[PDB]
C-alpha cells in the first residue's frame, strides 16, 4: 500500500470499466463508441484474409466506420465475455463469442458467429488501440464463401 | 501481506516461468515439452479451417503429437514474445510471432509465418490447457492453397 500502487489500481479499475462498456455497446449506441478512444486512437480487425490488419485510425474515422459496421452488422451482440486484466494497468485482453446477421453487399444475407480475442490498450483513461482477432474462415462460411481445407496427413489420432 | 497473496504471487511466478520455458522450447527439446503439462492436460489449435479445435488430450498424446510437429515444422521458432499475466495466477496469455519451414504431405514445402495468441491455464504448476489462436489464411498461403478474398463494399478509408 503505496500511492504509486493506488494510482495503478485506480487506472486499472477505470480502464476495466471502459472495456466493459465497450463490450456491452449495442444498437445505436455503437455510433458513439468512438468517444471511448483517444483522438489518435486506432481500432479494427487484425485477422483478415489478406494477412494484413484493417486499421481504423483516429477517433473521428472510428465514428465514421461505426456507420458502416451498424449497417453490415445490424443486430450484433458479444456474448460469453471474459475480461483479463494484465500486469500492465493500461492493457487488457477479452475472450468472447459474438453472433448476428452479416449484410455485405455482393453476398447473400447470412448469420455470422465466431470466437474472438480483443486487445485493448489505454492512454489517459481512453482507448489508444483496439484489435480484434478471430478465425476468418467462420466469416467465409457466413458469406457462403467455400473454405479451403488443409489436409494434415499423419496427424496423430 | 496475507499468505493467500503470497500463495498466488508464488503460483504466478512459477507459472510464468513455465510459459517462458514453453515459448523458448526449440529443436529436439520439443519432443519433451509435453512434460510441462498435467497428465490430463490439453493442447492444440483452436483456429482451424473446419471451425472446430484440434485438441490433443493428455500428456502422452502431446508427446506423440510432438513427433508429427517436429517432422512438419522442423525448425519452428517463436519470436517477439510478450507474456501477459492476468488476475488469475493460473491464467496467462501470450502474444507472439512464429515462423519456420512447413513440410506437409501433399503440399509443396513452404515457409509458414503467422501472428499467434496462446492461452495457458495451469493446475498445480503444470499446463492444464494450452490453446493456440492464429489466422488460418496465412497457413493456407504457406501451402500454396488459394485464399478467397472477402469484399467489404462501402468500407471507409
Ligand atoms: O467483421 C468484419 O469484417 C469487420 C471488419 C472491420 Br475493419 C470492422 C468491424 C467488423 N465487424 C464487426 C462486427 C462483427 C465482429 N467484428 C466487428
Ligand atoms: O500449425 C498447425 O497446423 C498445427 C496443428 C496442431 Br493440432 C498442432 C501444432 C501445429 N503446429 C505447431 C507449429 C506451427 C505453429 N503452431 C503449432
Amino acid at each position: 500500500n503505496t500511492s504509486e500502487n493506488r494510482a495503478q489500481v485506480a487506472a486499472r479499475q477505470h480502464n476495466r470499466k471502459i472495456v466493459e462498456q465497450y463490450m456491452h455497446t449495442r444498437g445505436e449506441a455503437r455510433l458513439k463508441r468512438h468517444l471511448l478512444f483517444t483522438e489518435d486512437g486506432v481500432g479494427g480487425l487484425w485477422t483478415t484474409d489478406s494477412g494484413q490488419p484493417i486499421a481504423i485510425r483516429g477517433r473521428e474515422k472510428l465514428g465514421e466506420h461505426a456507420v458502416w459496421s451498424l449497417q453490415c452488422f445490424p443486430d450484433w451482440v458479444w456474448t460469453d465475455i471474459q475480461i483479463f486484466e494484465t500486469q500492465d494497468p493500461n492493457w487488457f485482453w477479452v475472450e468472447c463469442r459474438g453472433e448476428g446477421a452479416i449484410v455485405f453487399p455482393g453476398y447473400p444475407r447470412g448469420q455470422y458467429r465466431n470466437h474472438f480475442l480483443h486487445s485493448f490498450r489505454f492512454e489517459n483513461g481512453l482507448i489508444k488501440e483496439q484489435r480484434e482477432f478471430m478465425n476468418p474462415c467462420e466469416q467465409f462460411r457466413s458469406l457462403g464463401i467455400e473454405v479451403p481445407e488443409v489436409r494434415r496427413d499423419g496427424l496423430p489420432s
Side-chain angles (χ1 to χ4, degrees), chain A residues 5-16 18-141:
Chain A
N5 284 336
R6 294 202 301 279
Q8 294 219 47
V9 166
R12 189 169 287 113
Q13 221 172 146
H14 167 104
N15 291 350
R16 189 197 174 110
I18 299 321
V19 177
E20 288 263 20
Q21 196 192 136
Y22 186 106
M23 298 309 301
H24 291 275
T25 300
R26 295 177 180 175
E28 299 291 311
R30 293 156 60 188
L31 299 178
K32 293 181 164 187
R33 194 183 65 196
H34 66 296
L35 298 181
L36 298 181
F37 284 78
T38 58
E39 195 185 318
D40 63 356
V42 172
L45 175 58
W46 257 246
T47 44
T48 70
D49 63 69
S50 81
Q52 298 296 302
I54 298 157
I56 301 148
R57 307 184 172 274
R59 176 201 282 151
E60 288 306 301
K61 286 289 166 77
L62 281 161
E64 298 167 7
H65 172 77
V67 175
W68 174 87
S69 178
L70 182 59
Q71 155 193 146
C72 292
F73 305 93
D75 65 0
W76 191 254
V77 304
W78 306 108
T79 60
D80 298 282
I81 293 168
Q82 286 184 278
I83 299 163
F84 298 100
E85 292 173 2
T86 72
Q87 75 270 29
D88 180 349
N90 286 317
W91 199 341
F92 286 73
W93 289 85
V94 178
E95 176 174 10
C96 71
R97 292 198 169 272
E99 184 173 303
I102 184 163
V103 181
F104 270 14
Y107 303 88
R109 181 181 204 90
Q111 187 74 2
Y112 176 39
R113 298 181 193 168
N114 219 163
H115 175 274
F116 297 86
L117 299 168
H118 287 273
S119 170
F120 294 89
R121 304 183 69 177
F122 290 82
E123 174 188 284
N124 292 310
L126 303 168
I127 306 173
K128 171 74 170 197
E129 182 193 70
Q130 176 278 154
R131 309 175 292 153
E132 167 186 313
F133 307 80
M134 51 69 158
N135 179 348
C137 297
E138 292 306 314
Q139 185 176 61
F140 300 160
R141 292 167 170 103

